[PDB]
Amino acid sequence: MDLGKKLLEAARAGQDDEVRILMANGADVNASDRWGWTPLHLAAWWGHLEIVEVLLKHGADVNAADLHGQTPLHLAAMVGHLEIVEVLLKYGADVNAKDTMGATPLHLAAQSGHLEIVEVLLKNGADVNAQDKFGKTAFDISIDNGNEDLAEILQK
Template sequence: MELGSHGVKMEDLHEYAELLHQSNDEGAKRMISRVSGILEATDDAGRSTPHFAAVGGCLPILQFSISQDKSAADRPDAMGWTPLMIAASAGRLEIVRHLLSLPDVDVNHRNLNLLTPLHYACSKNHALIAHMLLEAGGDVNASDKYGATPLHRAASQGHDRVRSFLHGHFFKTLRERNLEKLLRLFVACEEGRDDAAIALVAKGADPLLENKVNGWKKCTVQLLLML
């Protein structure tokens, strides 16, 4: 008889994992009551209840497990997969939503291949989950060990909806990060400091973004023509 962690028979643990993979929470509850230690037990891949529940979208058992051990919410398996990463890949929206509400869950956690939950959501065309991850601070520019970003993943799979969404988020983020440079660019243009304006554009300030000048919306290219 092969025993796993917490003295749980591997046969029981595999049965329990399969119940959670199928989102059979009633069957899983019966096993939790019957098999001591199974809630905390890990299999040979380093996965435990939150990982199993994330696969099948079994929210009640995932919540119960985390209520008993808060650190389990973000605990990686042997390959670095967290419950959030698994849920993002499997398209388990409610699991993702719950995990993102927890303070200790890292939205940008990377596994051994340097992939994040956002990589998997984009690769599997889970647009709403990708949106949730981005709203929670997911890094659209995160690169895996091959240099691929979530956008690369979406494009390589032909997921046009996700790709378009990521493009929009990328440029929105770029504009927000660019705000200080943009304001400095307008000042440089208004003051006729050509060298400073050129240097700011070279560093990423967008000359086509608009600002209000004397009540009129003008981009810096238009502003230069007015000088």
């Protein structure tokens, strides 16, 4: 049994100590499942903050991209885990990483209506001018969805 496989299991379950122990024994922190999700993707999607922190502290690739081209910041921003967004950015997460549809974390946060996450992404260099595969910006999403406070935030 791969140590990386054990870490993915532990990371899904939010088992803080078991995560530390597998890392202490030499588990690949960037091990990925059949979808390309790493322990960091899992911890980000499920909102396991302390696991995000220890993974990053012990050299996890903050910009690891899955088979859909999504990074942990894409996931945290769409689902609405602010504190995880903040921590990922602090370790140099690419705030404008494009998935295989051309979507950035800002597109996903805008679509989800997480306004504080949108503001935190902008403060950390997110580009409102970034276009997805279909030529749409996060601003266009806010106009299409009729989300006026979002539109105002993106226009500044």
